[model samples]
Target: GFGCNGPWSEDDMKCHNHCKSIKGYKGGYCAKGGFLCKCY
Candidate 1:
């Protein structure tokens, strides 16, 4: 997850499709205004 998209841009698989299951990814959450999917 470097920087999701999916709010209007619709890309990056919406935070890597739910942030790779959550955890090991250690990265998620868009620009902090739209695609909010924090999954550290």
Candidate 2:
């Protein structure tokens, strides 16, 4: 549920190192070079 790239959970949003939840793009897929948020 939590990763540098992710599809976060419904209850709580989060990532590693207390980073903000990087949301996946609205519709497109990640593997196709989409939704890859640089949540830094």
Candidate 3:
């Protein structure tokens, strides 16, 4: 996860947007429990 530190809803746009802004990370997806955003 990149800069993600709390619970997030499924398909959270915030995670996608935030991860995209970070260098080397192409995108993000909220974890199953919404506890993290994994970057791809």
Candidate 4:
């Protein structure tokens, strides 16, 4: 929720950068305001 806003992958609930596959990433969610990924 603290980056550039744009069209995100709703079908994929993974992080914008797809960090879930990493060992220390959590892969956040999208916000309602403008599809912003809470990923760092």
Rank candidates, lDDT, best first.
3, 1, 4, 2
By lDDT, who's the top model here? 3
Candidate 1 local lDDT, residue 35: 45
- TM-score-sorted candidate list, best first: 3, 4, 1, 2
Any residue pairs clashing in model 3, and if so which? none
CA lDDT of 15 in candidate 4? 57
What tens-digit string does per-residue lDDT give for candidate 1 at 1-40?
3445455655555666577767688555665675456765
Q: 22, model 3: CA deviation in Å?
A: 0.6
List residue ranges in candidate 1 displaced over 4 A: 1-7, 11-14, 21-31, 35-37
Task: Name every residue pair that clashes in candidate 4.
Answer: none
For candidate 3, what is the TM-score? Answer: 0.55
Q: Write the per-residue lDDT of candidate 3 for residues 1-40, one digit (tens) a residue.
A: 5445554344447788988999999888766555677778
For residue 28, what is the lDDT in candidate 3? 82
- Using TM-score as the measure, the top candidate is 3
lDDT score, residue 9, model 4?
44
- Candidate achieving higher lDDT, 1 or 2: 1
